[PDB]
Every structure is written in C-alpha cells, then in structure tokens.
Amino acid sequence: SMEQVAMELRLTELTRLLRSVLDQLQDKDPARIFAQPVSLKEVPDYLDHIKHPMDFATMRKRLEAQGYKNLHEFEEDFDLIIDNCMKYNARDTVFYRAAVRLRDQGGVVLRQARREVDSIG
C-alpha cells in the first residue's frame, strides 16, 4: 500500500533523527565507558546485578534495524545505560561519575530532540 510506504518513510526519518541524537549523546562519553556491553568474561556475575544491560553499540544495532518506534523507546535505553551504571558502581568511581556527566549533558540533547519529534511529527 501507499500508506505502509509513507509510514516507512517517516520511520526512516525518525531513524535518521535518532542516529544524529545518538551521535551527540555518545560524544558526551569521550572515555568510551558506555561504548560496548559490560564484558561477561570480565564481570562474570554482572547479570546477577543488572537484569537489562545496555550500551551504545547495542542501541546502534537496534537503531539501524529501525527498531525504535518513537523517542520514548530510545530514551528508555539511554536511561538504562545510566541507571545500570549508577547501581553497579559506587558513587566514588570513575564509572558512576561518568554516568552522572552523561546524564546531565544528555538532557540538553534529549530536550531538543523531543521538541523536534513533536514539531516534524
């Protein structure tokens, strides 16, 4: 149908918008602490602590598979990255501090992407 296609064009644009947003969020992690999944070879008990792991490479696979239907789903995943880190790691660690900074600097990017997604529909 002509409708399914028009739908597919919007998703593709949303995917295009979210890709840009993801690039901006990931520049706020210059140490690449959140780039890849936590290694289960290196942290074998991780899944006993964190039930839904997340990282930027995993978000990107979902992104390019057009797996995010809306900003809300995308934000849920970004928030997992931060929240998982803040539980697993103590307050006086480079890891926890990095999450706080990503959260604070990400807010600005996410605030404008909300307005853009509403705006462009």
Side-chain angles (χ1 to χ4, degrees), residues 1-2 4-6 8 11-15 17-40 42-60 62-68 70-110 112-119 121:
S1 86
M2 196 51 254
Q4 287 305 322
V5 158
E8 286 156 1
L11 189 55
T12 290
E13 288 310 306
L14 175 70
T15 302
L17 194 145
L18 294 181
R19 184 185 301 114
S20 162
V21 171
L22 192 54
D23 290 333
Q24 285 176 82
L25 292 173
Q26 191 159 16
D27 287 328
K28 309 313 193 158
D29 171 34
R32 301 194 65 85
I33 291 164
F34 307 106
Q36 295 289 329
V38 173
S39 174
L40 307 179
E42 300 172 3
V43 188
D45 73 349
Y46 188 62
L47 306 177
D48 296 351
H49 295 267
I50 296 299
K51 295 312 179 185
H52 299 102
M54 196 38 58
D55 67 270
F56 288 132
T58 299
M59 289 189 68
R60 198 171 291 284
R62 184 166 169 189
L63 190 59
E64 294 305 332
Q66 300 189 341
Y68 293 113
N70 53 52
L71 193 52
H72 185 83
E73 291 186 337
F74 183 93
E75 285 173 306
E76 290 194 326
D77 272 356
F78 177 65
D79 290 336
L80 275 181
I81 297 179
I82 295 304
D83 293 336
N84 288 344
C85 184
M86 292 175 82
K87 295 171 186 72
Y88 186 81
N89 305 103
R91 197 157 45 248
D92 71 342
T93 60
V94 64
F95 306 105
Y96 186 108
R97 289 167 175 283
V100 166
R101 291 165 63 81
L102 178 59
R103 184 191 68 189
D104 292 352
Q105 305 197 299
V108 184
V109 169
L110 294 175
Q112 208 52 38
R114 170 44 68 201
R115 299 191 61 88
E116 283 175 284
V117 158
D118 292 355
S119 168

